[PDB]
Design a protein around this ligand. Sequence first.
Ligand code: XEW
Ligand code: XEW
Ligand code: XEW
Ligand code: XEW
Ligand code: XEW
Lengths: 391, 391, 391, 391, 391
Amino acid sequence: VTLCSPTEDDWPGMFLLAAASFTDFIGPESATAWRTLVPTDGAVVVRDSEVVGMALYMDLRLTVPGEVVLPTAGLSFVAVAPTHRRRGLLRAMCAELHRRIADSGYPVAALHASEGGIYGRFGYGPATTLHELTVDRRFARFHADAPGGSSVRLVRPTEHRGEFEAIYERWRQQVPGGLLRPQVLWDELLAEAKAAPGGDRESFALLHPDGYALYRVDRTDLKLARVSELRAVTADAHCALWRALIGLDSMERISIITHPQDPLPHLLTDTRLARTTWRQDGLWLRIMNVPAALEARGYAHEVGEFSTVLEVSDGGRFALKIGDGRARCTPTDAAAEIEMDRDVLGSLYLGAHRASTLAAANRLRTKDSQLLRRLDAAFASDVPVQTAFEF
Amino acid sequence: VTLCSPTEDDWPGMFLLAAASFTDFIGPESATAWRTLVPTDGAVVVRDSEVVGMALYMDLRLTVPGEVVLPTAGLSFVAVAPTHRRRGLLRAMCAELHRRIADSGYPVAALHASEGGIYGRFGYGPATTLHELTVDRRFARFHADAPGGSSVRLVRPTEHRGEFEAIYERWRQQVPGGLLRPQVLWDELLAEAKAAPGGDRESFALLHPDGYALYRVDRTDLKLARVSELRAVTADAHCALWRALIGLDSMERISIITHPQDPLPHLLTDTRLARTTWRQDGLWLRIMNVPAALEARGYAHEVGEFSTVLEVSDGGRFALKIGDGRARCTPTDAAAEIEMDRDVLGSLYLGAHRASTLAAANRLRTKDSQLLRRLDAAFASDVPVQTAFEF
Amino acid sequence: VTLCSPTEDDWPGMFLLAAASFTDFIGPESATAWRTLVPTDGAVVVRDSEVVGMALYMDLRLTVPGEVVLPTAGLSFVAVAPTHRRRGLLRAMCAELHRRIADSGYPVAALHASEGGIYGRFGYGPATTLHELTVDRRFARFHADAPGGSSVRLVRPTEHRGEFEAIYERWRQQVPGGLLRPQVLWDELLAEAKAAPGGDRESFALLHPDGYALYRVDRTDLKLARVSELRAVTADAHCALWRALIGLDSMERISIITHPQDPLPHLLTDTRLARTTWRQDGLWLRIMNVPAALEARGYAHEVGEFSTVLEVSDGGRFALKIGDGRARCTPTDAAAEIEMDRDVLGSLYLGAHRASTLAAANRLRTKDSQLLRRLDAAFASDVPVQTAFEF
Amino acid sequence: VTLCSPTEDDWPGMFLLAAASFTDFIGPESATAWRTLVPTDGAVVVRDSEVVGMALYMDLRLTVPGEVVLPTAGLSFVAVAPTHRRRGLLRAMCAELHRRIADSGYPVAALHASEGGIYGRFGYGPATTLHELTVDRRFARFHADAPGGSSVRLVRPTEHRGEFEAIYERWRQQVPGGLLRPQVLWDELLAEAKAAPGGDRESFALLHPDGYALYRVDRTDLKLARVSELRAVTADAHCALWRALIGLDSMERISIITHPQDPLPHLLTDTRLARTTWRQDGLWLRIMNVPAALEARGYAHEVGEFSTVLEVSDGGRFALKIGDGRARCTPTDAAAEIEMDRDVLGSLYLGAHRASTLAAANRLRTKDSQLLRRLDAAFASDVPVQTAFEF
Amino acid sequence: VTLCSPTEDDWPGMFLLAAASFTDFIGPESATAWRTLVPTDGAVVVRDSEVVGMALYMDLRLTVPGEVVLPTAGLSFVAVAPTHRRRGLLRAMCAELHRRIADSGYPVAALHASEGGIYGRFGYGPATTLHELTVDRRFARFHADAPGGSSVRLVRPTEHRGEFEAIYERWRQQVPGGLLRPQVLWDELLAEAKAAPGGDRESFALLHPDGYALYRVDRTDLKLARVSELRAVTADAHCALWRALIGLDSMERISIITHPQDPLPHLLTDTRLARTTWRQDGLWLRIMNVPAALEARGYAHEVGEFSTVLEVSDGGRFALKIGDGRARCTPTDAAAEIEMDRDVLGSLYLGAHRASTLAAANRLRTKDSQLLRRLDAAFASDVPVQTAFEF
Ligand SMILES: CC(C)NC(=N)NC(=N)Nc1ccc(Cl)cc1
Ligand SMILES: CC(C)NC(=N)NC(=N)Nc1ccc(Cl)cc1
Ligand SMILES: CC(C)NC(=N)NC(=N)Nc1ccc(Cl)cc1
Ligand SMILES: CC(C)NC(=N)NC(=N)Nc1ccc(Cl)cc1
Ligand SMILES: CC(C)NC(=N)NC(=N)Nc1ccc(Cl)cc1
C-alpha cells in the first residue's frame, strides 16, 4: 500500500469508495462542488491500482469566543475500504494530513465524527453539542413576556437567496461555532430545498429582517415539520420565527437540531413542551498549535488576572496568563499546575464543556480547586456555542 | 365550598382523593409515614361533608450554593377532585399555604410539578434539570485517564442502611439541590428495595466507602438495569461505582436519572455511548422572601464586586450588591436596572439556568449586557446542581 | 390587511400558500384544473403585496333524500399563513364567501373539514360519516344467501373511462351525498391511477355492468389492497365486486372507506371479519336558506302529517308542515316548539344523525318527545347517505 | 372458458393479469426478456376475449447430487384472475403443462411457491431450504482458525460482468440446486444493481478470484446491508468475502438468504452472532419420470449396495438398486417395501429432507427401519443443497 | 482473592451473587433443591470475607448416539461479581472444576451458555440446536397421510406426575441429548405449572399413553399458547398431541422450542405454517477424555470400516478405527490425518454439526475429502439429537 496526493485519475476510485462508505453521498456532481473547498495538497489516498483509503481537509473559517475568526482545516471524505480494515490506514492518513495542516499554518483542525470512539486518540475533542428539541405545537402558548405579542413572511427559499446569505453571514461572525458558508454550499443547500421523487418534500422559508428558518414536512410522518436551519441575529427575530413555526396549524410537532442554551422553552408558558429528543457531539476540534489557539480567542472579563502552567500531553508546556479577556501563552520548563491530553483542550476551547466536569473524570489534572474555578470561568463563552453546518 | 386545616376525620376523604389523583399512591400506610414531615397547620382541604381539594407542605432542608442549608416548605399531596375543576380551588389552596409558609418564616418553597404549565403563575420556577443517561454497556470501555484502573462491594441494601445514610448525609450537605432525608423516608426507600409480586424486581446495592448505587433490573426489559440512586462524595467513588455497573455483564443497557454535568460520558473512550434519553425539570422553587434568599446563598468569587437594582414583579425592589462571594439585598426606590417575575428568580437561584438565557426569552429585562454577564457569573454554582429525591 | 377577489397576479401567491398549507397539494397543474369549477367571484384573498389568506367555493350538485339535486357551494382551498394566525382572517373570509353564496342563490354550502373543531361556529354540521372497513380476506367465506353464487372483469382504468363515468353518474343521482363529477375530476382520478416513482402503485379496476371498484396495493404494506372507490347501483353488482376483491388471493387484507350501512359484513358467514378500523365525519353542510333547503328534500312517507314551529338560532322561525313525503316551511312568529343552531340542521339534513341523538346532547331542544320521534322518522333517508369524493 | 397456447394477441392480456397478480412485476420490458427462456408451446392461457388464467414453463438446467445437470421445466408466471377463483383453472393449466413437459422429455419440473399449501397436491415437494442469517457485525470477531488471517476488491458490478458470470458458472455446476443463468438474467441482475428514484440504493460488489458478494444498504434501515447473492467456489473465497462484509464499519447488521449448512457461524468466536431470522422452502421439485430422475443423480458411496421396491402413489412401482454411488430403477410388480406420494420423492431428491423425518410424519411408509437408515444415507448430498435464483 | 470449596457459611454469599447474576433465580428454596444434585467437592468459590465468584457441577446422565448413557458433569451456577470482572476468576474456577471433573472419572462435561462467545476457549462446543416453531393454528390442516385421522386427554399436570415421569424416562433413554430428570426437578417442574400472582398462567397437560405436552397461555399475548415441553416416544403420540394442540380453538398461535428435525411441518398440508421464529445453541459439551468418549458412543452402521489418526489440539493424538458401529481409539505418534480443537469434537459428538461444515470453516483440518465424508457419515445420529432441559 502507498500513501500520496491523488492525481485526477484517482478521483473516480475515490467517488466509488465514497458511494460505498457514505449513505448521504448525493453523487459525483455534489462531490465536485465540495472539491472547490479542498486546497492543493489537501487530499491523501492509499492505493493497493485501486483506491482503498482517502482523507482530505477543506479550508474553513471558524468563529471562536470573542468574535475571532480562525483559519480551520475541516477534515472530511475520510474512508477506508471494507477490504482494508485494521491495517493502520486511518492512522497513516491522519498523520500525513496533520503534518500538512500544521506545516501550512492552521492553528486548529475540525471534523464531524461518524462514531464517538475514533477521533479522541488523534487529538480531537467534541467542542459543540447538538440538542434536538421537539415541540408539541398543539399545546404551545407564548408566555406574556415573549417578544412580538407580521414581521415574518412565508417565502420560497430560491427566491430570497441574497437575504439568507446576508443573515447567515451576520450570524456566523457573532456566534462561536459559526463557519463561513461559501457560494458552492449555498448552491447545494438551495438544490436540497427542492422536492425529490421518492425523497424529501419541498422546503419553505420563514423570513424576518434579522433571521430565517428553513423547514419541510417529514417524508413519512406528515404531522412533523423538521426545521433544517434557523439563524436569528436578534432575540426578536428568534421569537418571531418560533411564533410562525407554532402557527403551522396542520402539524402536531416541530423538531429542530439546536444547541443546549436555545431560549425556545422559556418563550412558552409550559417549558416542558420543548422536549429534548436527542443529544450528540457536533463539531470536534484538534488544537494544532497550543499557543496560537489559546492567544487567539477572547476570555471572560469577569475573572481577575491569573497565571498558571499548562502541560498538553506531547503538545508542550506553557506559562498561561489570562487577564482583561486576553491570554499570553509562552514556553516554560516550570512545574505544570494543569495537565491534559490535546483532545481535552479542544473540548474546552469553545466553552461547551467545563474544566471542572473534565477534572471530575480525571481528563484534566490539577491539585488546585481555585485554579479549576478560574479556568472554568475564563474559558466560558458569553455567546453560547452553536453548530453551523455539517461537513 | 370551604377552605380549612383538616381534622383527623378529613384524612380518609384525603386518602380517597389521593388514590384517585396519584397512580404512585402506595397506600394509606406510606401516606401516614410522609405525614410525620407535615407541620401542624401544614395542610389545607376544601370541602363541598366530602373532600374535593387538598394541599400541604412538608418541613425540608435544602442545600443551596455555598453549602448553605435553608428551611424549605415542600409542597406535596396537591389534588383537586375531577368533579371540581375550573372553580379556583388550586389558586385558593396555594394562596392560603403561601400565606402560612411566608408567616412561618420560610425563605423558599419547593415542589416537583406533575405538568410544566401550572406552577409558573404561582411564582415557582424550574431550578434543577433531570437528565436520563442510557449506556450501551456492551461497548463501554473506560478511558486510560479514568480513576480506579476492588473498592466496591455488591450488597443487600437492607443490611447496610447505616452506611447509605452516612454517605447520603455527606452528599446532601455538599451539593446544591441536596435535601435532608429523614428516617421515615429511609424506611420507605428500603421497603421499595424488596421485590413485589407483579411489581418491581429486587434492588441490589454497590457500596464504596465514599458512594453507593441502588439498582434493579427493569420489570419487563430483562436486559435493562435502572439505577434508582447513585450518591458519590468523591470522583474516585463515582468512577468505581460506574466500573461496577458496566460490569453487569448480563445487561445490554444501564439507565440513570442524573444531572447535566454528570462526568460519566468523559470516563469512556466513546462519550457518545452515554446517550441522553430524557430531560425534564426536576425541583421547582418559589422565593418567598427575596432578600433572605439572595443574602443566604454564596456567589462566585471570580466576579468582582458590583451593585445593581433588581425589581421582582410584585415582590419588591432591592439594591443588590455582590462581592467576595456574598450578597447584600436592601429596599430601594431607585430606578430598576433588572426586572423579572418571581418564578425567574427561582430558576436562577441554584445556578441551573443562565440569566443571559432567560434574558434572550425576555423573562429577565435589562438594557445592560455587562450586568447580564456579571449576574450569569455570580449566580453560577461551582458544584453542579443535582436533584435529591422527589416529593 | 385587505380582503378582495384575487387578480391573475394573486394566483402564484395562492399556490405558495397552498403548497405550505396542504401536504396533498399535487401541484399548480392539478390546482388549475380544479380552478375551472370556481365561479367568477368564487374566491377571496387577504393581502398584507403578499397573500396571507385565501378561500373559495366551487359550483357543485349534491343529491339529497328524495333524489333531489341541489346547487351547492363547495368551500375549498381555505388557508391562513402561519405568520397570520389569530387575526380573524378565517372569520372575515368565511363571512364574505357566505354573503356571496347566499346572494348568488345557493340553498346549501358544503366542505370537508381538516379538523373537527373549526366549522361548527360558522354553521357547518357534519352530515355524512366515513367508515373504514378492513376485511381479513384469508378467512372470508360468502353466506349461502349472498347473490352471485363471471360478471366482473379485471381491467385497466384508463381504457374504460366511459363506463366508469356512466356508472358513477347513475350512482350519484340515486344516493344522498352523491356529487356530479365533472370531466376535469375524471381527468385527475385517472392520472392518479398511474404508478408514480417513489409514490403509489398502479391502480386496477373491477368492472361490472352496474358497478366498479378501483383499488391498488398499499405502497409499503404489500399484503394490503386499498379500494379507493366502489360505486354499485345494484345489490348484485356490490356482491359481485366483493366476491372479486375477496379473490385477490395474494392479499391478507382489503380496506375501503365506506358508509355505516355498507351491507358487506352481512355477505359473509362471519360478520366480524369486516372490521371497523376508522370512523370520521365526511361531508359538512351549512344550510344557507332554511325554507328552500327544508322544502327541497323528500321526507319519509311512513310518518303521518304533522306541523311544528322550528327556530334556527339567528336563522329564522318557521311553521314546518311535513306530510306525504313533502315539507312546507313558512315564516311565523308563533312560539317555537323546536330550537337548534344552524349546524345541527345541516347534521340532520341528509339523515346521518338522529334528532333524538342531538336532543340527548341538548343541541336540539323541545319539550315534546312525540315531536322528536316524528322528526327522527321524517328526516330519515330510505337510501343510506354516502360520501362521494373529497374536495 | 377455453385453455390454449397464447397467440401474440394474448400477451397484453397476460401482462395485465401479471401486473394485477405480482407486486414484483418490473414491467412488460423485464417480462419480454424472461420470455426468451419460454419454449414454443411452453405457455397456456385460459380465455373467458379476455385472459383469466395463465401458466408457463422455462427451459432450465438444474444441478443435482453427483454434479449431474438435468433439463428442468421451470414453472412461472402462474396466475388466475380474482374474478375466476374456485373454477378449477389452476388444476386444468397444471394438468396441460405437465402433459406437455412429460411428452417433451423433461425428467423434472421445478417452481418457487407463492404459498406453502398449493403445489403439494400437484406432486411438487419443497427440495431446498432458504435460511436468512443476520450478523451483528459490531461484535463479530473471526476465530483464530478462520482462513485469510487483501484478496477481495470493492467494485462496481456493471464493470466486472465477465468475472461474475465465470464464478457463477463454476458455482452452479458444483452445487446441487445450481441453475444455469442465461445472458438475459445477467442483463436483469445488473439493471437491478442501479439505484432507483424512490426504490433500491446502489449495489456494490466484493470480488475475489473464486467468489463474489453483491450487496446494498436497505432502502429504509440505513444500518442494514442486504447481501443479494454470495457465490463462493472455495472456503478461502467464502471466508475472505465475509471478512470484507464484516468490515462494512458503517453498518450494524449484514443479512443474507443462504442455506442451512452455511459455515459462516463457525468462522466467528461467537457462533450465536450469525442469527437465523427467517427460514422457508426455496425450490420445489416435481419428479416427472421416476426412473430417469432416480438413475440420473449420484448417491453416497458410504452406504453398501442395497435393493428395495419403491412405490410412488400413482407414479409406478420400481425395483431400486443403489450401489457404488449409482441407482438402477426398473419396473416391478413385486410387493412394495417403501411407499410415498410423488411430492415426497421431490423433497428427498436433492438431500434437503431426510427419509427418516418424512417417515416420522407418515409421508413415507416402510416397516423396515434398516431400509430407512439406508435411504437416508444414500440420498444425502456430500455438497450441501443451495438455492440458485428465484423464478 | 482465594479459590476453595465453599463451607455452609459461604452459601448465603453465593445466593446473593446468584440473585444479582440470574434474573431466573426463583429463590434460595429452589436453589437448595438443585443443590442435592451437586456432589461433595462439586463447587468452588472465590472470596475477596465476601463471595465474588462461584461455579459448580451437578451429577447428570446424558444419552449419546447408540442409546449409551454417560456420567456427565453439568456446569451451572457460574457467576463473577460485577465488581471483579477481568481478573481471571472465570478461567481459575473453570480450570479447578475441570481438574476435579477429570480426576473424578467423568468422560464429558456439559453446560447451557448465557452467551455464545465464552465457553469455546474452555473446550465446550455447541452440541444441540434449539429451534422455535410458531404455528398459525387458524390455517393448520393435517395432511391425508398424518396418523390419527380420542387417545389424548386434557389433564391437570399435578394429578398425573407418575405418568409424565414414566414417559419422560422412556424418551430420555432413546434420544441423544436426553438427561435423567431426578425427583427434585419433577418437584420444581410441577411447582412452576401453578399460576403465580403477576406471573405465569396455569399450565395444562395433554396426555397420551406414549407422550405428553405441557403448555400455558402466554402472560400478555392471550392468543399465544407456549408448549413448555412435548415428549413423545412414538410418531403416533407426536401426531396425536399436535392434533390436540391445533384444537386449542381460542389461540391464534402455538409456539414450541424443539429440534431441527421435528416432523411437525410434514404433518400439515402447508409445511410453511410451522414457522422457524428462533434458533440457538442448546447443550454445549466438553470432551474430558477423548478415547473414553469416542469409544463409548455408537456410530452409523452404513459406513464401512475405516482407520484414521485424529489429533485434538492439546488433547492427544489417537489411532481411530470405526467399524460395525463401534470405535477403537488408541494412543499413537503416527502423523495426524485430522486435527481440531477440543470444542469442535464436542460439536460433532451428538451428530448436530457435520464434519464437512466445520471443515469448510477450517475448524477441522484434513487433506482427505474421502475421510471427511466418512467422518460425517459415521458421527451422524440415526435418532435426531434433542435438548432435554436447561440447567
Ligand atoms: C453534509 C455533509 C455530510 N457533507 C459532507 N460530508 N461534506 C462532504 N461530503 N465533503 C466532501 C468534501 C470534499 C469532497 Cl472532494 C467531497 C466531499
Ligand atoms: C416520591 C413522591 C411521588 N412521593 C410523594 N409524592 N410524596 C408524597 N406522597 N407526599 C405526601 C406528603 C404528605 C402526605 Cl400526608 C402524603 C403524601
Ligand atoms: C381531494 C381534495 C383534497 N382535493 C381538493 N382539496 N380539492 C382542491 N384541492 N380544491 C381546489 C379547488 C380550487 C382550486 Cl383553484 C384549487 C384546489
Ligand atoms: C425473480 C422472479 C420473481 N422473477 C420471476 N418471477 N420470473 C418471472 N417473472 N418469470 C417470467 C417468465 C416468463 C415470462 Cl414471459 C414472464 C415472467
Ligand atoms: C432452568 C435453569 C436456568 N435452572 C438452573 N439454572 N439450574 C440451576 N439454577 N442450577 C443450580 C444448580 C445448583 C445450585 Cl446449588 C443452584 C442452582
